[PDB]
């Protein structure tokens, strides 16, 4: 079912969050997490994924 010829990709996993999740927490925000001192300000640039 979930293995499509051509590439299933409809499924995502949060990769860069700030802190560890609480039990049974559901996080849906998609804000750009800053991977560095320089703030992202949304800009998906360097140190921003």
């Amino acid at each position, epitope marked *: *079912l979930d293995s*499509k*010829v*051509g*590439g299933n*990709y*409809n499924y*995502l996993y949060r990769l860069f969050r700030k802190s560890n999740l609480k039990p049974f927490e559901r996080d*849906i*925000s*998609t*804000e*750009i997490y800053q991977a560095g001192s320089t703030p992202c*300000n*949304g*800009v*998906e640039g360097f140190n921003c*994924y």
Partner: antibody, heavy 123, light 108 residues
Framework: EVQLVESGGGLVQPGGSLRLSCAAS????????MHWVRQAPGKGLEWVSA????????YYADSVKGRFTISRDNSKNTLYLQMNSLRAEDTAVYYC????????????????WGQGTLVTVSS | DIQMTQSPSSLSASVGDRVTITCQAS??????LNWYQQKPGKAPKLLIY???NLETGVPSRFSGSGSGTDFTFTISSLQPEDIATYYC?????????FGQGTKVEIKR
């Protein structure tokens, strides 16, 4: 109210370049997936490209693979479409649509469908 | 890719008649198929998503059905503003393809 006001279409010679814009207002732009779909004059619908938020998970239709580049914007919240090496077969009206495939597995469809911009590849 | 042999290419029906437009599939795409209504000079409008769920803000006379590789699609009451061309769009395998489309017009 969701509003996808499109612009940037116009007249281009074959082999040229053109950038389309798709502004968004009334909803969280950074949390939705945006697509581009074109329709040849008097013909059926053909998908073009899709970008699911990230600046690396971009996917294009087989007919435009390599030639078309998709990009988005924060702040003012707009969507862009880079077109390169256009041919006579590329003349179509380009639409930007919505999509919440991210989390929602129900509204997989294109919730809004902008009004579209006309691009003509001719000298 | 996924091919749709949407048939008939065109059919004639009168006001109030029941309309069915078939949309096939390739490999058991379940219910990842959408339906679209398009008027001349107008942008496409969603009609049925996930093959059964009607969109919000749409009159209840529009309904869809089917799953897997066959999709039936059923119109209950024709209205004079319902004249348009309808397209079925697969949304399973890296959604690319649409349907060829069937032109539905009022029999007179």
């Amino acid at each position: 109210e969701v509003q996808l006001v499109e612009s940037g279409g116009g007249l281009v010679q074959p082999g040229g370049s053109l950038r389309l814009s798709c502004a968004a207002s009334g909803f969280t732009f950074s949390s939705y997936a945006m697509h581009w779909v074109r329709q040849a004059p008097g013909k059926g619908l053909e998908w073009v490209s899709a970008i699911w938020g990230s600046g690396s998970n971009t996917y294009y239709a087989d007919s435009v693979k390599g030639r078309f580049t998709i990009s988005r914007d924060n702040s003012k919240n707009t969507l862009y479409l880079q077109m390169n090496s256009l041919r006579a077969e590329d003349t179509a009206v380009y639409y930007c649509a919505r999509g919440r495939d991210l989390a929602a597995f129900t509204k997989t469809a294109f919730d809004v469908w902008g009004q579209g911009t006309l691009v003509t590849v001719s000298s | 890719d996924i091919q749709m042999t949407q048939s008939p290419s065109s059919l004639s029906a009168s006001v109030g008649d029941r309309v069915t437009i078939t949309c096939q599939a390739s490999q058991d795409i379940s219910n990842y198929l959408n339906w679209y209504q398009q008027k001349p000079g107008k942008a496409p409008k969603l009609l049925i998503y996930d093959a059964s769920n009607l969109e919000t803000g749409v009159p209840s006379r529009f309904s869809g059905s089917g799953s897997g590789t066959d999709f039936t699609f059923t119109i209950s009451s024709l209205q004079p503003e319902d004249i348009a061309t309808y397209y079925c769009q697969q949304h399973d395998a890296l959604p690319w393809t649409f349907g060829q489309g069937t032109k539905v017009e009022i029999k007179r």
